[PDB]
Structures are given as structure tokens and as C-alpha cells.
């Protein structure tokens, strides 16, 4: 797919929300991040009780 | 209403517990606690830079 295309040499820049974990950080090189992110949870409009 | 709320509120208790306590994490004047000098405890209880 996408990363795979990056190992094909027809286009190089990959400008889109690509994470950087260690396993994926072996075969290509990134820059300093421009956004922090993490897994988060939502439930509902908080409106309990009466 | 105020009297009932005050009666419900009163519950000081809260004896010191362990090694991670707000009372046992910072100094004050009301909690001067000691230990006999130059003896077993005090030597060990000095190396912990944390």
C-alpha cells in the first residue's frame, strides 16, 4: 500500500498523518513531529442525575 | 441545615500511613519527626537522592 509505495521510488514525500513507532522507523527517515497524538475515549454528552 | 452539615462534615482522623503521603512528603512546623542520630536508619536514609 502506502508505505509500500514509499519503497518503490516513483514518489518520495509522504505528507499525511503517518505515525512513527520504532518498527516503522527503520527503513525511512522522518522529521521532527508537528503534532502530538494518542488514543482517547469518549462516552456521551455528560449529563447525569436529576 | 448548617448544624446538620457541620455535624456530618466533622471527621479529622487520617493518621499517617506510609512512605507516600502528603504529610510525609514535605516539611512543616507541626510535624517535626526525628530519628536517633548516626545509627543504622539515618545513614541509609541519606543516600536516597530521590
Amino acid at each position: 500500500g502506502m508505505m509500500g509505495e514509499l519503497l518503490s521510488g516513483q514518489a518520495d514525500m509522504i505528507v499525511a498523518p503517518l505515525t512513527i513507532n520504532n518498527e516503522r522507523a527503520q527503513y525511512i527517515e522522518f522529521s521532527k513531529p508537528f503534532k502530538y497524538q494518542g488514543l482517547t475515549i469518549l462516552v456521551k454528552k455528560e449529563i447525569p442525575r436529576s | 441545615a448548617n448544624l446538620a452539615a457541620f455535624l456530618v462534615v466533622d471527621r479529622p482522623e487520617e493518621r499517617i500511613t506510609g512512605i507516600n503521603d502528603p504529610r510525609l512528603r514535605n516539611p512543616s512546623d507541626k510535624f517535626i519527626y526525628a530519628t536517633v542520630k548516626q545509627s543504622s536508619v539515618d545513614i541509609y536514609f541519606r543516600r536516597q537522592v530521590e
Partner: protein, 50 residues
């Protein structure tokens, strides 16, 4: 460059038939920038995924 469709980071909108696409503006009337992107699986199925 190669980019991944995933809201709300990069969009994909139907091409206006004449040859260009919509001319929209922000709530502040600022010049919403855009470029022309060709991508597969627009609709239907085969034929190089349209």
C-alpha cells in the same frame, strides 16, 4: 507526493464538470487554497479505478 484519504486531514470532493472545481471561502472570507488531485476508486469499479 502520495497522500492518504482520512478525514479530517485531507478531503476528496467531486470535480466540478467544467474542468476546475468549486470556489469557496472561509467564514472569514479567507482564500481557501486547493489543488487538483487524481485518485482511484472515484466510483463504479474497474477501468484503472476511474
Amino acid at each position: 507526493i502520495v497522500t492518504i484519504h482520512q478525514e479530517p486531514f485531507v478531503y476528496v470532493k467531486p470535480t466540478m464538470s467544467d474542468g476546475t472545481c468549486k470556489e469557496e471561502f472561509t467564514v472569514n472570507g479567507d482564500p481557501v487554497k486547493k489543488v487538483i488531485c487524481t485518485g482511484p476508486n472515484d466510483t463504479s469499479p474497474g477501468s484503472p479505478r476511474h
